[PDB]
Amino acid sequence: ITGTSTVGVGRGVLGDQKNINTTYSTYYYLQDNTRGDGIFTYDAKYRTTLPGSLWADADNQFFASYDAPAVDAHYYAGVTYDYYKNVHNRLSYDGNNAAIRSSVHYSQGYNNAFWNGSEMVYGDGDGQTFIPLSGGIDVVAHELTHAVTDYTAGLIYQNESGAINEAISDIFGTLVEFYANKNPDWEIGEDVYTPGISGDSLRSMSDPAKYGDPDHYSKRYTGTQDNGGVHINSGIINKAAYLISQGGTHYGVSVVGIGRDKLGKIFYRALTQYLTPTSNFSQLRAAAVQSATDLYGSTSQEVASVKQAFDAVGVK
Numbered sequence: 001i002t003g004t005s006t007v008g009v010g011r012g013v014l015g016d017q018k019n020i021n022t023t024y025s026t027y028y029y030l031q032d033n034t035r036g037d038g039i040f041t042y043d044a045k046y047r048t049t050l051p052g053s054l055w056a057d058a059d060n061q062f063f064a065s066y067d068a069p070a071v072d073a074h075y076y077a078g079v080t081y082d083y084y085k086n087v088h089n090r091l092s093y094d095g096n097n098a099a100i101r102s103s104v105h106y107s108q109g110y111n112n113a114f115w116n117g118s119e120m121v122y123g124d125g126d127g128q129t130f131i132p133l134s135g136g137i138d139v140v141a142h143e144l145t146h147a148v149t150d151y152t153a154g155l156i157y158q159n160e161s162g163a164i165n166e167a168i169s170d171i172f173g174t175l176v177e178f179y180a181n182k183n184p185d186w187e188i189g190e191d192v193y194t195p196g197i198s199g200d201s202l203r204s205m206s207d208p209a210k211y212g213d214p215d216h217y218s219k220r221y222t223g224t225q226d227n228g229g230v231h232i233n234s235g236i237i238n239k240a241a242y243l244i245s246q247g248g249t250h251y252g253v254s255v256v257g258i259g260r261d262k263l264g265k266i267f268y269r270a271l272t273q274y275l276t277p278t279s280n281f282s283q284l285r286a287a288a289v290q291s292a293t294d295l296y297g298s299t300s301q302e303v304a305s306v307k308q309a310f311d312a313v314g315v316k
């Protein structure tokens with residue numbers, strides 16, 4: 001909508017107060033003019049027709065419990081935008097400042113969040129398995145990272161390329177959580193998962209096996225469920241990325257950790273320069289090795305650590 005850029009205030013899903021960039025034209029809309037060609041948040045009104053209505057508010061105050069999911073979707077989209085721009089020199093998901101659109105209040109009791117090819121969509125959860133999913137910065141950044149992948153490598157969402165596509169989103173979702181630096185960790189979705197249970201999440205990158213996911217190639221899922229195990233076999237790549245960053249000895253193989261910033265550089269470069277729609281795990285290892293070589297040199301610690309990390313998870 002055409003109008004002036006304004007600044008509202010509200011509470012997110014977890015009760016935290018924050019400012020949001022809005023736009024004024026009769027009503028105050030969830031439209032942030034300060035990033036690229038805009039970030040726009042819509043209300044799906046418990047339906048599944050998308051996008052819904054651009055979020056409109058009478059007073060620029062967003063403290064109602066109904067407001068909370070939209071506050072977070074909008075705000076964490078902005079944080080994710082800032083991460084790609086400031087860290088990777090990437091302007092929005094297409095690299096050309098595409099508008100970022102999100103809808104909240106999708107369906108009723110919907111325990112999930114996803115990128116539908118054009119926009120973000122967040123359920124409210126059923127209050128037991130999930131609370132509104134946009135309250136998780138790693139969830140927001142995970143799903144926005146699928147948009148980045150769709151415009152770059154184009155990793156097909158099935159089997160190994162699919163598990164890489166998933167891992168890439170867990171990796172950058174986690175790096176975005178560390179960037180924002182509020183209770184960061186190497187698990188996925190903990191802030192919105194199971195309000196009654198402390199310390200759990202959907203997935204762990206540091207120990208995929210915690211939730212039954214493989215942490216080694218010899219444990220790969222080879223069946224047909226979950227598009228050939230895209231959320232299952234990602235554990236193997238997640239563990240490798242965790243090792244590259246933090247270090248550790250995994251099945252007898254020692255890895256020297258090089259830290260989060262370098263992990264982010266190597267994997268962004270693999271994503272955007274080397275990976276293709278059909279890349280398998282072994283091809284990911286070669287892309288990551290070539291990326292680390294471009295960035296730090298062929299004899300570097302960084303290259304040696306990438307090789308050790310993939311050795312540790314059985315990927316040659």
Ligand SMILES: [Ca+2]
Pocket residue numbers: 057058059060061062063
């Ligand atoms: Ca209001």
Ligand SMILES: [Ca+2]
Pocket residue numbers: 177182183184185190191
């Ligand atoms: Ca966290």
Ligand SMILES: [Ca+2]
Pocket residue numbers: 138174177184185186187188189190
């Ligand atoms: Ca997390």
Ligand SMILES: [Ca+2]
Pocket residue numbers: 190193194195196197198199200201
């Ligand atoms: Ca929980």
Ligand SMILES: [Zn+2]
Pocket residue numbers: 142143146166169
């Ligand atoms: Zn995903």
